[PDB]
Design a protein around this ligand. Sequence first.
Ligand SMILES: [Cl-]
Length: 151
Amino acid sequence: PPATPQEVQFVQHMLQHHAQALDLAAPMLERSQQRTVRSLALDIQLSQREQMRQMEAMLGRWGQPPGEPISPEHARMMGMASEAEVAGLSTLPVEQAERQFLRLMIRHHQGAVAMTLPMLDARPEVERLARQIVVTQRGEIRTMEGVLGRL
Ligand SMILES: [Cl-]
């Protein structure tokens, strides 16, 4: 049976949501001199990309396009960083940019969890993906909260 419109939209939106994690990590790898922050940024890039590859494959199998872009207001509700917030990671003094990176990525991951919980009650591969997203996001949030506390 084909993926439902809700399942298709969920994957389309999550693929774009995950992509932003890469935009947030890039300035840390460019600017931070903290091995702690750099290590964490790399790890999040790798975990988000693994899930993006799964989402891309799903959309390909379903013969569904990528979503239309998310609107700024709706991106904000999803916990995504605004245009300005992402730019701050490149323009703010580095120590402030590191803290902002963690705050933005935490809020980002909280939005991902909140988008995903309703999908736990779905087509098996979507349920599996949803569970993986929630587990991974929650692990990374806990690490980021620890790092933010130690900075
Ligand atoms: Cl990749």
